Write a protein that binds this ligand. Structure first.
Ligand SMILES: Nc1ncnc2c1ncn2[C@@H]1O[C@H](COP(=O)(O)OP(=O)(O)O)[C@@H](O)[C@H]1O
Ligand SMILES: Nc1ncnc2c1ncn2[C@@H]1O[C@H](COP(=O)(O)OP(=O)(O)O)[C@@H](O)[C@H]1O
Ligand SMILES: Nc1ncnc2c1ncn2[C@@H]1O[C@H](COP(=O)(O)OP(=O)(O)O)[C@@H](O)[C@H]1O
Ligand SMILES: Nc1ncnc2c1ncn2[C@@H]1O[C@H](COP(=O)(O)OP(=O)(O)O)[C@@H](O)[C@H]1O
Lengths: 135, 442, 442, 443, 445
């Protein structure tokens, strides 16, 4: 999922464009006051009609707990493997974002282009600001 | 949106003293049932009592669903009316009690007061600063009216709303602060230099005057089930549409109940109860009735209405027979409205109203023949014959249904009793209950 | 070509403003059922009614499925038609109520007309023009982008917005490619390299589209046809996003889910809004449920609920049972295996068996459709055999007769060929006689 | 004014200081022996010593069974966990019924914990990261540290964070000029809002404006928390709230019930016993109330026999209204109240009795004066005779249509004619059965 | 291929002449002249390909040759024609409906034919020089490919530069590039450079250096069933569903659009339709809903020829409470054509046993063959067929090559058939567990 690349495919193949993705890709950059744009934008209109971006949070959990620690006495390989699994840099980078000045540092001051940046900004957006945390 | 079965009923047809008129608002006859339903309607409109069960019983084709449609039509806007059939409870991803809990909680609305600020003006200059990968976005907006001019600040979603429906520094927009909606009213500057990267034909509006920022109060209604589904997990708003809300835990419902009482205490929100209508209630398990017996005693419970057309039939999930197919403990805590069968004058008035609904011209003799065949056979058959006779009469290039068209429609399309007789006369040609049939005609 | 049990049936053969004649449209006999189906076809073409159900019943091999397919052929390919078997409603992913509702919504079509303005052609030049007064700390401030387009008999130079440049760089458009520029949004895309740029390079394996025809500027009026179920599954399935949940779900098995009533209500109201603007057009269709005796009583009760909806299509049912118990009950003897509450809501069309000459004409038409040549005496023997055993068994034996005739290097079908084919292949009665007169577990 | 629903005229058992019950007290009328037995049970629960004591309330319909359990819950108070239940709710489609029963068992044992928190808070003044030498090295993040300057009232601190804390901070979308709240127990960060030290009226994203937090930046505060054992079991079975990958992806997937193993419950018991041994926690056992217990089948009953003998189980209250019926899931076992004899041997049955004309009349009086209605005496006697003739609940539920029919005639008092009209318009079970028997086509 | 000697592996086609006249003993089939002639007629109807949706039922007593006849049809059908063989119990799934499983079985048996042209350039990389312009928009590559016999130099596009800088080759890997389309594959590493790196690596393999011409021309004909297209066009990466079976109730819109595009491709001339046969062995245990779906599903032009086999008498159809001939409802039997098989005589049993003995490389005497024929007349046929194989091992333990009468008698004594087992149970019923679970384990009383 993380390093999925949308490469081009040759047309001479058995794969088609069914009507579902023939409707899906049109409304990616479509504006408002359109027919087919508004016929596929039911969810956003229902979001902004009911004033859902100024609502309050009603439920918070009672107990929050980290995953159960596994310990092996006298082996650094276990600690390295557990730290690699719990804090894997690819998925942790995918769920986070690089700071802007850091991006300017590695792109301009170091010459690294855009396409070999690590993938970032894949965390889902919460409903409000109020739903972003349990506190 | 189309001409349906109950499309001719708009209300209940009652006075201020709750006395039913003999023909009003598309309903004829049935004065006691209409009066009782009006009492139940006033009982819902007062909103001071909860968890009352009303049972509507009678023979088939009598007007139970018509009465429920009249109640829902006269209930008015923004009051919830959940109408389900009895067989929708049995699901593959939800237990019966969970589906019944969701159906109960869909019929209680919460009316929330909100404070918003409306900003309308003429756009002077837009500055948008984004990072290299386009993740972090911030900027400043300079908007103005004829009197004032202010420089604002923008966030991520404001910039995303400005990038869509692209504003070009001279368009007149209106912003709602609490809703976060961008509306482009039109273009007022009418700039001279235009490049051919745009094809819109934006209207000429005037620059607004007066105050730039105004204060407004808005009111919207949200049901309890939506609040539960939203607070259940991270992406519950999509599950409000996809139906992927699998067995919400009880702690969520307890905390939502406490929060709703807290909102009622502060004057922010108020509770508007509604009606849950369970049509064909005899198709329910014994466990559903056992759940309903205790779900009716809660504080947040709507007015439950059930309808059935069964006599002393077998209760589902058991091995005995009960009146109306419902067990006696549920029937103890319910109030029964009984409907009566129809006369011939009522049947003639019903057919005349249904003919006027379908926009069909009828003669006197055609209406009399339809009344006679609706007395002999069922009412619904003679009601169904009207559109078929209209099409047959339209085939002969005249827009008036005559007796010959009704006779042709009666000849072409069969009744229940005529079909039963034709089956019983030639029972070898049909597949029996033992699966035997003579296909050869010799 | 390729023929399968049908395709000699083209329409109903009714003349205008009149009755059905004897042999027309590949139909022989069945005059009353054909006239009734013509009346039903005219009612569907009127496009006003909602939830009208008919049921056509008769013995096996009488022409119920043939009449339903003739209705679908007479309506045309613009009107939707959803064929179905009663056994298809039992799924292991969602409840049968949801499957029935999906098949209900699949039978209502929408016709949308739209105007598209586009720019396309080979790229001749691409220069981002520098600004007059650049800003400090930034490289290459752009004021406009000059793009030159060339197509067949046309060449036009465009001036674009500065913000099209990162979409140009994202699509990695170079000089010599073919682009596709929407008018209002920009939103370029690489169709492919021009086919005139294939021979200068030995190994260049990008696709090579031809140079597009006509001018670079064109206003094409497109018409797109969708159903309401397509809109429902487009709105429920979340749009192309960047969160890990959507990209996770795109690679997984597309599990069906219970679509809520709220999404259907919102889709209905936005469709009604755009219809009232005069842009869209609603096309109701036919849902055909074959072999309805396989349905359960819960599905029958939900059908009773759903037939009173506002946007239900015309439902056509077929059955061949007599007095049979309804599935899922114990003691409900009902005609055609259909419970009486559903029987009251529909009209019944009767189909009658054929005669000797009708069987002979049907066999002759099936022979002349399959490009076979049959002698007259063999035709008489086949008609007698079809009267003795079954019409379908006489129809199924034509192709082995043709094969045995072609083995002897002949074209005409001879009486000894059909004698050999009758000897080689049995029917139900002779096989049952073999079964009853043996004791070897056969 | 308020909303009334089938109850809420009942506030408690209405007992004396010595356990004797007044006849009309606490919203109860009659049922003296059952109220005294429930008071003894309430004292047994408040003793906080026993485990797995189970009673059963038996009697006919409309005799006061669920009212006694609700009165028990009101007498115990809100600090004791009370878990209402219906016997049909144990049949789930996600997990087996045994696990649902054990979850509802563990949901009825509470816990009060005095825990302490480490808090860094203040207004953000600076936010500068330091980059790494090899950003594309594959191992390790882009940044190495982030310098964060926090300013509170009479204080200013400078913090140096790892990328792990900064990832949650930037997930909270923290800018310069905001007031934040870093909790060091879990790494959770809450963005309180914009500071009020700057301008207010130049925003477009409906924020809130917060004064500077008092005290020092680094703090230690005590919070009293009330949790159950099932909360700990659920939070450990599906981990969320950490900053690792596993707990972060656990908040995004769809939640689902799982069969919690016995080992996790044993470890949670060990940790809770350790917390009690330090004088931090305190155990509060509660009540599990299973209404309509005849809906259970033989497998749940056989597991209930095992589950009552454990050393942690709460007090269980059951109710049933069957004489001698077959147990569900069997064919030949006929037992009293639909409860098998091996479970009946572990119970203590409390009998409930029917009412009389006087008790029905005063119950109707109490329900009328709760619902803000004014009834005449002759109408009261007519309703009492109606209640003895047909049902208590039918007489109770006819009060509001009578009030509506009185109000629609511009009148406040309920008279005899309103009761006669409500008799005409609305029916009961016996008259409906009488209509059903003498009818043509399955009315 | 990977196979041992199966139950009927001696059968290679139906033994028919050019006039569809069965020879008495040819191609591994003995007797059953009328059934073999009928199967030849069905085979000709399949090979014609203009007739769709035909149901053929093969009915007979057990051990008569119904699935042997289906095996003969499958062998004589030829290659690249789909023949799906399933049992009746396979459609009762947990993650699939019976209707959907039957649709997936129906669409596996009709396919399309696709031919394509390949111009492969397979060789060993010598040296790749990557050159870029000053602007950097144009990239040229000096590719030095080399086979054993010769070596040439090509110029690569920027898309080849991108496709080779991903999964990078290291000047000595074996790659093949299609000239016409541009398919890029890395076959592995050459054997000549297998000694320089001292350790293998996680994702490498050693292939031989290709010889002959560098550029080769070859056409490939592909046969794709409709079910493959349905699975592929339903998801982002669908071949995993092709190999793991997690398709999960594909919708109807994709099937309708695939039918439309297959028809328009047949019209355009790119593809042509290859129909096939679906064989449902032991059809009698299908539900009544499956029978109704089979009734409606035979009336489509995209339907194969369905062959069913049943050995039941007048039994009870599953899902109902009545009885019907062959366990099938009468409306399905109306939509059917029945081929009847008949039990064998002594000579056919003798010839079948000699054929099975020759298949298993067992040498029988005349007396042993006569005794096995007598046993197969008295008992069933499969009992003698299994007695052959165990008597071979008994004679092999005796250090003998040919099976004699004594080995057959010993194998008859050591192994029992059904009749003697039934007698031995019925005379000692007290020691076996009854229907009520009563048994007497103790030997004395
Ligand atoms: N009083 C009435 N006014 C208008 N229509 C009526 C009335 N009574 C019955 N109908 C018609 O009868 C049908 C309702 O019958 P039905 O829904 O079967 O009642 P129930 O379900 O209670 O038996 C509808 O078509 C409705 O139009
Ligand atoms: N009136 C008719 N004219 C021509 N063909 C007919 C007629 N009636 C039936 N048939 C043929 O008989 C065959 C079987 O009829 P069908 O409709 O399948 O029977 P059923 O109504 O039991 O489904 C069809 O292939 C159809 O072509
Ligand atoms: N002693 C009492 N005093 C006042 N109200 C009572 C009394 N006993 C029963 N009721 C009322 O009668 C009804 C009895 O229902 P409930 O006790 O909940 O279950 P059941 O119907 O099984 O007895 C309740 O609504 C309750 O309010
Ligand atoms: N005509 C035949 N020629 C050769 N072998 C046969 C023939 N008929 C049956 N057999 C053999 O008989 C055995 C069982 O027959 P089978 O095909 O299973 O019949 P059924 O399916 O009716 O039981 C198979 O091993 C097969 O090799």
């Amino acid at each position: 999922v993380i390093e999925r690349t949308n490469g081009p495919k040759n047309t001479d193949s058995l794969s088609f464009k069914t009507i579902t993705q023939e409707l899906l890709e049109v409304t990616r950059n479509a504006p408002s006051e359109g027919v087919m744009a508004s016929l596929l934008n039911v969810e956003k209109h229902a979001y902004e009609r009911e004033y859902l971006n100024c609502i309050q949070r009603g439920y918070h959990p009672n107990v929050s707990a980290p995953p159960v620690t596994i310990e092996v006495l006298g082996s650094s390989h276990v600690t390295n493997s557990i730290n690699n699994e719990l804090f894997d840099p690819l998925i942790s980078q995918a769920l986070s974002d690089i700071p802007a000045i850091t991006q300017y540092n590695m792109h301009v001051k170091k010459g690294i282009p855009v396409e070999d940046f690590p993938k970032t900004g894949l965390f889902p957006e919460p409903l409000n600001k109020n739903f972003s945390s349990n506190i | 949106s189309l001409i349906a079965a109950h499309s001719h009923i708009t209300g209940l047809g009652l006075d201020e003293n709750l006395q039913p008129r003999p023909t009003s608002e598309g309903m004829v006859g049935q004065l006691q049932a209409r009066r009782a339903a009006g009492v139940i309607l006033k009982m819902v409109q007062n909103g001071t009592i909860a968890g009352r069960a009303v049972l509507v019983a009678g023979p088939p084709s009598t007007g139970k669903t018509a009465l429920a449609m009249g109640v829902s039509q006269s209930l008015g806007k923004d009051v919830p009316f959940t109408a389900i059939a009895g067989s929708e409870i049995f699901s593959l991803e939800l237990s019966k009690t969970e589906a019944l809990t969701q159906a109960f909680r869909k019929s209680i609305g919460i009316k929330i007061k909100e404070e918003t600020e409306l900003i309308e003006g003429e756009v002077v200059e837009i500055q948008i600063d984004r990072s290299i990968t386009g993740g972090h976005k911030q900027g400043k907006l300079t908007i103005k009216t004829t009197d004032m001019e202010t420089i604002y600040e923008l966030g991520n979603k404001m910039i995303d709303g400005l990038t869509k429906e692209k504003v070009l520094a001279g368009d007149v927009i209106s912003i709602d602060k609490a809703s976060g909606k961008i509306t482009k009213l039109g273009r007022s500057f009418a700039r001279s230099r235009d490049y051919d990267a745009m094809g819109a034909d934006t209207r000429f509006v005037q620059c607004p005057e007066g105050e730039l920022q105004k204060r407004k109060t808005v009111v919207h209604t949200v049901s309890l089930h939506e609040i539960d589904v939203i607070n259940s997990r991270t992406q519950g708003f999509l599950a409000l549409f996809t139906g992927d809300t699998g067995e919400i835990r009880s702690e969520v419902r307890d905390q939502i109940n406490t929060k709703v009482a807290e909102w009622k205490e502060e004057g922010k929100a108020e509770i508007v109860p509604g009606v849950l209508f369970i049509d064909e209630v005899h198709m329910l398990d014994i466990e559903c009735f056992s759940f309903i017996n205790r779900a009716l005693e809660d504080e947040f419970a709507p007015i439950v209405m059930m309808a059935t057309n069964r006599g002393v039939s077998k209760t589902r999930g058991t091995n005995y027979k009960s009146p109306h197919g419902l067990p006696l403990d549920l029937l103890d805590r319910s109030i029964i409205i009984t409907t009566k069968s129809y006369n011939e004058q009522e049947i003639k008035t019903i057919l005349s109203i249904r003919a006027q609904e379908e926009e069909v011209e009828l003669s006197s003799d055609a209406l009399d023949l339809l009344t006679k065949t609706g007395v002999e056979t069922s009412l619904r058959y003679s009601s169904n014959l009207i559109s078929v006779a209209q099409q047959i009469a339209m085939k002969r290039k005249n827009n008036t249904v005559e007796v010959e068209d009704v006779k042709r429609a009666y000849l072409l399309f069969l009744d229940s009793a005529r079909s039963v007789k034709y089956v019983q006369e030639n029972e070898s040609q049909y597949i029996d209950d033992q699966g035997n049939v003579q296909i050869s005609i010799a | 070509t390729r023929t399968a049990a049908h395709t000699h049936i083209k329409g109903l053969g009714l003349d205008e403003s009149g009755v059905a004649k004897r042999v027309e449209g590949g139909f022989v006999g069945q005059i009353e059922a054909r006239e009734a189906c013509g009346v039903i076809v005219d009612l569907i073409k009127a496009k006003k009614m909602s939830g009208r159900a008919i049921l056509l019943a008769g013995g096996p091999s009488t022409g119920k499925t043939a009449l339903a397919l003739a209705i679908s052929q007479e309506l045309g390919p613009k009107v939707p038609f959803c064929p179905l078997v009663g056994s298809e409603l039992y799924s292991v992913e969602v409840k049968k109520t949801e499957t029935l509702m999906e098949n209900f919504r699949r039978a209502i079509g929408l016709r949308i007309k739209e105007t598209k303005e586009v720019y396309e052609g080979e790229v001749t030049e691409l220069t981002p023009e520098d600004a007059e007064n650049p800003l400090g700390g930034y490289g290459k401030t752009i004021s406009h982008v000059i793009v030159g387009l060339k197509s067949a008999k046309g060449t036009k130079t465009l001036r674009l917005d500065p913000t099209i440049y990162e979409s140009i760089q994202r699509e990695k458009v170079s000089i010599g490619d073919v682009i596709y520029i929407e008018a209002n949004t920009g939103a370029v895309k690489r169709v492919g390299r021009s086919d005139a740029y294939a021979t200068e390079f030995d190994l260049e394996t990008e696709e090579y589209v031809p140079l597009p025809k006509g001018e670079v500027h064109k206003k094409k009026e497109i018409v797109q046809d969708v159903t309401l179920h397509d809109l429902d599954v487009a709105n429920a399935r979340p749009q192309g996003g960047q969160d890990v949940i959507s990209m996770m779900g795109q690679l997984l098995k597309p599990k069906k889910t219970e679509i809520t009533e709220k999404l259907r209500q919102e889709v209905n109201k936005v469709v009604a809004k755009y219809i009232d603007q005069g842009v869209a057009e609603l096309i109701p269709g036919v849902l055909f449920i074959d072999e309805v005796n396989m349905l359960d009583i819960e599905i029958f009760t939900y059908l009773n609920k759903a037939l009173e909806s506002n946007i239900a299509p015309v439902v056509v049912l077929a059955s061949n049972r007599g007095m049979t118990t309804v599935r899922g009950t114990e003691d409900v003897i009902s005609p055609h295996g259909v419970p009486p509450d559903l029987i009251d809501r529909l009209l019944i069309v009767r189909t009658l068996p054929y005669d000797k000459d009708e069987i002979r004409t049907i066999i002759e038409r099936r022979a002349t459709v399959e490009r076979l040549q049959v002698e007259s005496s063999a035709l008489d023997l086949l008609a007698t055999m079809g009267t003795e055993t079954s019409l379908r068994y006489a129809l199924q034996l034509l192709a082995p007769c043709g094969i045995l005739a072609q083995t002897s290097n002949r074209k005409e079908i001879v009486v000894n060929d059909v004698n050999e084919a009758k000897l080689l292949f049995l029917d139900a009665k002779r096989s049952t006689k073999i079964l009853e007169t043996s004791a070897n577990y056969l």
